[model samples]
Target chain A: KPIEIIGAPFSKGQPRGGVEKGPAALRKAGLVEKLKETEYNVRDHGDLAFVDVPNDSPFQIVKNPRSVGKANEQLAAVVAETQKNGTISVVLGGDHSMAIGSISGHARVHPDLCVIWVDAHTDINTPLTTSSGNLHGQPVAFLLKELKGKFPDVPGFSWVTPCISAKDIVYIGLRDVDPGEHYIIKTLGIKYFSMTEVDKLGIGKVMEETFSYLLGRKKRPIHLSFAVDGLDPVFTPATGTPVVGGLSYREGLYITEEIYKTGLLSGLDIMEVNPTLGKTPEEVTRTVNTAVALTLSCFGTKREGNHKPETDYL
Target chain B: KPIEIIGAPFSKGQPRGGVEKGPAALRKAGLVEKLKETEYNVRDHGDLAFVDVPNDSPFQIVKNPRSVGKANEQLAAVVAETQKNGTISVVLGGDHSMAIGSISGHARVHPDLCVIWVDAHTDINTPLTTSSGNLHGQPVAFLLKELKGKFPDVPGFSWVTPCISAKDIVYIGLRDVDPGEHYIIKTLGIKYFSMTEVDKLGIGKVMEETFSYLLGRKKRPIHLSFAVDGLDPVFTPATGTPVVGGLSYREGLYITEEIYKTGLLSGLDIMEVNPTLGKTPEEVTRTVNTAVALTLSCFGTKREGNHKPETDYL
Candidate 1:
């Protein structure tokens, strides 16, 4: 199977700037070459060209409404095209806001796909409920059919149709959640493994339960939206909005390895790596390297060390 | 029961100068005061003074044989005295080599005590097998009676006696192990969870198996030998020797919390926190704070947040 890599270098998601350079940093850290080493037929699609919507005013408290919406609209089309021929779409993100387009485009092709949203926050607050008004935190609300009527229609998002149901998504590494987002999650009866649950059950059992819940008898294409902030700040300090007591580097790799083993992964979004946010060059390098490592794990990099097949050895 | 704090400020175990300050740094970070907050009848034993052994020469490759041996002999007496009257001993260490005296002293009182040695390296190399000649790397060898005849006799260690059996020890967070240490561990069938096993089994399962293997049906006193270097360098960077992929802060705390819950943790040694080794003051602070936090967890601190009892709340 071939892997299509798309760089979404558009960050109107939140109040961060350097997140827009996440794609360039990840590529510079040898993400593409490493995936090639995994022996995947990898294709780099460069970066998408997002048009700046002039005079794009905030719709109420929402920042960069037109720009964010228009960017996602462009991203959705590209992602939809990438997934048309059964190619696994790997989206190097500007921020978590890109998940809106990535998941929307994925569901457009494989409507039966299940999402494993690995993030520190649920990213499910509706426009009315969001205090920050960052579209990144509200992408899940916009993508879920269950939350269609809960939020008001934004300016440039008219082309986006609500695709996935609430049950189609499962969340991992949720620690910082708003009160309103919490209410919606409980009301929708979504399955989630918060940091508390991760602590009690351990990441191994949490992933086990996640697979059991998402793929009971039949397996659907899996869409993994991995936010770098889902990891501890020590590992990925260059990310925006880092949470403490999050997943360890080993646990993060383990999650990706397990997802890769399922043989059902169709789309992945590696998000929220902001090179400009780190205090030093070393921090940025560590963050980018970690992002690349997690991406490689998704493409079958084993922690126990990888070995060539018998044919190659011979 | 009351909590007794003992400070061992002698550092001849390794070639590190700053490790002698570990006990003072931990105390300055409010370890004793915090233990008092946990409502334990905390007694601060202050620091134990050690007489410097003059003309202390190397025995073969072993460095500081007389000094290291004499310091541990003094620490053993202090620890042994603290363990009397059913007090839980918390020995603040100068280095990991202090574990020899701490465990020896604890075992002097509770002969049936089991050890949970949490460290990145298994300090089990016999004097004949040690390449670095660091006593910190060979404390377990001195404590285990199973390796009694395996090592040659040393000058100052004539007063020392091996206490614990091979089956009484369990190791966690082992990422760096010498060839001879590996041989001893495997040959004795010692229960250990190296970093590889920690990754495979998860910390929760690892602790569970540790307790099941040690406690079985009858429960004995547990001596927890916690090396700050056992934690990831991100959390405890001020240690003498740090290996990557060690325990995360959460995992480190979880291990202590679980052991505390067992109500059998009779003695603890938080060792190898070398404040002078860190590049900056912030790193030193983080290392010391982490040591304090892990020590608190060994008493009764919970990550789930703590509250006053109902009588106090009312």
Candidate 2:
């Protein structure tokens, strides 16, 4: 299957600067070459140039409302176009806020798709509920059908329509959730496996349950919105807002490998890899390298060693 | 039950110097104080003074055979004495080589005791099969009854006896195994969960199968021989030999916590924490701190917040 890589280099979703470099960092780490090695016809769409909206003031407490909204609008169209070609859309993120566009574009094509959101936080706080006013934390709020009535009139997001249902989403690796987001999750009855659950039930069981919950009745397209911060800071120290006790490198890879096995992954967002954030060069390299590995797993990399056809070996 | 802490400061088990400082490092990290907070009657038997055997030469390929053998003999006596008093013995190790004494001493009293050996390597190489001739890697060979005839006559190890059955040992976190050790494990039908197994069957299931295998027919004492190197080097970087893919901090703690829940852990060893090996002081601190945390979990620490009595809360 062909794979499409779109770089969303906008970082106005949060208060960080270096997150904008996540796309170049991943590309530099040989993501395209690795995918080619796996025999995937990968096309790099370069990067979307997000226009700077002048005097784009905050909508209530939400930061950079116009800038974030406009960037997602551009990303959503790119993602939707990529999906139309029957190619799996691999969205390299600027911040988690890119999920708004990635999922929106995916759901535009496959409205019946289920989402497996791997993140350290729920990222579901509404504009009113978020203390920091970061739109990255509120992207899910704008995309959820259950939360349609909860959002305020933000300037540039009017083009976005609610495309995801509450039950269609499952969260993995959540450790640091805000109280407001917790209430939203509970009130909406969304399926989630917090880090506590990850600890109690091992990742293998967690993945099993996640798949069964999402695809029990019938198989549908899967949209994996992966935030690199969902992994433990030890593995991804260069990500923004990394929680201490998150998924291990093995668990992270396992999740992606399982998703790939389903052969139903339609869209993916590898988010929150800030190159400028690590304490050392090695740390930054580790984070970028991990992001690349996770993406490769989503495409077809196996931990138990991949093999070629018997004829090739002969 | 009261807890007795025995310091084994001998490092002749391997070619490492700072591992002898493991006892002092754990103590300095407030291991005892933390246990006190958990309300255990902790009795710390100060660091063991190992006598230098004059002209302690190598036995064939084994380096420092006399010194390692003599130190373990002394250690076996102390461990046996502590168990007789009905105390849970926590041995602070100089290296993994100390397991020979720790397991031997514990099995002296509880002959039916099963061992849950947690480490990145199998550490089961026989003297004849070992390449490096490090006693630390060959301790399991010296202790297993199934491999009694496989060993040669080492100089100072005359007092040692094989007490553990092949079926009584279960290894966790094994990523590296010598060809000889692998053959021995297979020949004896030893139960082991290498990193592959750990990934395939989640840690929860691994622990479940472990307990059922060891304590299925009836509950017996469990000796958790945990080498700090079993944890990922990111968590325990100051070890003698660190492997890349090992247990995460959460999985490491989960293993101990599950053992604690069994109420069957009678002996514990936190080994291979060489404080002087890390690239930075912070790395050393992380290793020592992780060692301390794992020990605490084995005693009574819970990730889900612990509760006091109803009256205390009021």
Candidate 3:
């Protein structure tokens, strides 16, 4: 079985830059055909439309709270329907903020789920802590709120419940997690594979151990909420927030291929894809394509056979 | 043997578009790694910069004609040196116009060389027929003057002697020839394969026949000028002047792969790779990447035993 494609184009959750065009760009780069190559009964349900809520929702100072929220609600329904059909959801992105809807929809079905976040920065800023006031910087906190806790003081977040525990997430390739997000990850005992570890153990060994640890437990939906910034700026030249040290095309591909090998994976949320995020349209397109290819690799669509790694793969 | 990586970073052969950045962009994207994957003994000589010319050089309405000539001349020397060392010269281009220097360099060694022009535009525009006055639109004619005396007396004409005959040139994937250029092809009696021919007779057959035509004649040097724009926008969305209903990536790959199989492809020129020419940097990068991939296919590299053409027989 191959990874199923779910076009989740929600621009809500957080809004700093580059999340809106995530899903569309991925689809445009032959996302579906790639899945087919992996032997998945791929069903491409175009893009999910979110109700347009004006940006003036009572949220962050400049957050489009209402609009981004309404959109996520629609996205939640779309992801749920796709999940019920037994297709392993491979999400195309809008922004990291769209993860709220993706998490909600997938978690509703598989309550016991794990989130493996491969990001350069910990997207864990809350409305109160964000300096840039971009809503995109705060979705993860909202997704992890206690069920008894009130929804974000923000207006549009009314429908979302605290859906997961911090313990449920395993982050990899983190070199720029927010200070606040770092405390949350450490305090909550969340498993993370930071760049320091990547330098020591290599992405290959890190991903292998991630699988062994995650799958060792009762299999839960592995929600991969990926950001293009996870790759080095050299690879994703057009990304909005390009961290200096990121994965190479081959290194990123290795992770995806490894993930695909385990059939227990559930939903994938590929966020933070912006076509105009780079220096030029072509560079942007190349970055977009790099992200798209990374997602496909995560879904197990690569050249087959034993591609043994060389001595200095990193 | 792999094509030696040569860069002629001058935009003089055409109007401004950033073709000079082609070699840098490709090298940055791990062109060496790609070649190494195919197990080719790859050497990176970096780019051959144009030697500083003393003030006086000729130019007419054309932009940077002298500079383009100087750059290509250096490129000729580079190609000759590489081929002299028995390495195939693979030139990463800034524009289609770089062919003049590259082809002349290759032609110098193998006097009976035949050129296979793969591009959407015939690139046969002389200064008289050009609408935009972008010199890129005229390199083919300049290269041809080495064969036919139809080209106008433009700057840098003295650099190369007649290297090809009207019968020695085979133009393929042409769908955007200007009326004047079309007349030139007809008048010159050039053998051409347009998109129509590709649609009627698959690229596999066309390429097979092309290989025979080029390699069959006196075991001369076979130079491949692969322009990314020749492929349909669907295949190479990042090309400078994309024409619809052109060759698919698979078809384009087949053209090169078939050329590789013949063992006659001695020199290569890949031009019109201005990633910055597109809408964004990422888009540009994708185009740059696709062009580079197309270059790999032009070598004898196959996907294992038989996976290229996507559908082997294709």
DockQ in order: 0.06, 0.09, 0.02
Deviation from native of the Cα of residue B131 in model 2, angstroms: 9.2
Model 2 C-alpha lDDT per residue in residues B114-190, reported as the tens digit of each score:
99999999888888888887999988988989888776878888989999999899999999887888988998999
TM-score, structure 2 vs. true:
0.62
Please give each candidate's TM-score. Answer: 0.62, 0.62, 0.50
Q: What DockQ does predicted model 2 obtain?
A: 0.09
Question: In CAPRI terms, where does candidate 3 land?
Answer: incorrect
For A62-136, candidate 2 gives per-residue lDDT tens digits of: 889899888899989989998988999999987999899999998888999999999888898788778898988
- Residue B250 in model 1: shift from native, Å? 8.7
Sorting all predicted structures by TM-score, with the top scorer first, yields 2, 1, 3
Looking at candidate 1 chain B, the ten consecutive residues that score lowest on lDDT are: B305-314
* Local distance difference test, each candidate: 0.88, 0.89, 0.71
**How big is the positional error of residue B126 in model 1, measured in Å on the Cα after superposition?**
9.1
Summarize candidate 3's per-residue lDDT along A1-314 as a digit string, tens digits: 53456666565455445566666677677767766765456777777666676546555464777777777777777777777776677667767777778788888787788888877877777776677667666667778843224334667677887788866777888888777777767776777888888777766578777877776767766777877778887667766677887765545666666677776678886777777667778777777777766766665444222112332111
Candidate 3 total steric clashes = 44
Mind giving the per-residue lDDT tens digits that candidate 1 earns over B1-314?
A: 88999989878899879898988899888888888988579999999888888888899999999888888888888889988878999889878988988888888899999999999999988999998888999999888888888879877888789899998989999999888889889999999999999888778788889999999977999999999999999899999899998898878888988998999999999999898999999999989988998898888765433444443210
